[PDB]
């Protein structure tokens, strides 16, 4: 479970000038894949097609050997889990938010998962704990904490495919290490597609897919790509020695 294949995929929203051109790659079950490339390189569109917000104009996409066009839509969506950088939540208790993705779970199973994903602690400090109402869709919580809940939520849902933003950096250091431990736990034994901009996650990915102008221009592990002086090398060194501000991430991979 979690196998993903794009075979000669072409796509355009306009049906005028293509956005994606001959996208071809294969992901083995349980791999961690970094999609890297500047804004508008095709990252978003690849993920939009995998979630089947649109069908491809040419080629095909397979999830575990089956064309996604032939998969029941509710079964495709519930087998894919997304965590964004700026998560939106529902205006109920913390417990109820977590219980999306697994409504049938017991109250203890919720706490176990929240424990396994390092969000239990901050939840307990909320004025009413797991019963705390998250008014205005999580307004009171910090961006990191909302991301924490989404991770625990997705952990409960146990999808076979994860589509992930990197952890937010506009967080306290304690919460960041917390989020990263939580994401590692979430990714365990699952196929993970990461819209990557952190050096560390790009360096440790099982596979890097480098996109430029809607095409794959390099594909492989960091050690392979870094010894040729192509586009990846340019992205990786674009910040080298430059002072500011968030040294962990390549700024050109989201701006």
Report on this model:
- With 255 residues, the chain is an alpha/beta fold.
- It has one domain (1-255): Rossmann fold, CATH 3.40.50.300.
- The chain is built from eleven helices and ten strands.
- It is globular and about 55 Å long.
- The two termini are 33 Å apart.
- The tally of beta strands, per DSSP, is 10
Q: Which CATH class applies here?
A: Alpha Beta
Outline: globular
Annotation field: number of helices: 11
Distance between the termini: 33 Å
- What series of H and E elements makes up the topology? EEEHEEHEHHHHHEHEHEEHH
* CATH architectural grouping: 3-Layer(aba) Sandwich
Count of discrete domains:
1
Which structural class matches the secondary elements? Answer: alpha/beta
Over all CA atoms, what is the radius of gyration? 19 Å
Question: Which helices and strands, and how do they pair?
Answer:
Layout: E1 4-11, E2 20-27, E3 32-36, H1 43-50, E4 58-63, E5 66-67, H2 73-77, E6 80-83, H3 94-99, H4 107-116, H5 120-125, H6 135-138, H7 143-157, E7 161-165, H8 173-187, E8 191-195, H9 199-204, E9 207-212, E10 215-220, H10 222-225, H11 231-236
Parallel strand pairs: 3-8, 3-9, 6-7, 7-8
Antiparallel strand pairs: 1-2, 1-4, 4-5, 9-10
PDB class: metal binding protein
Keywords: ABC-tpye Nucleotide Binding Domain (NBD), metal binding protein
Assembly: monomeric
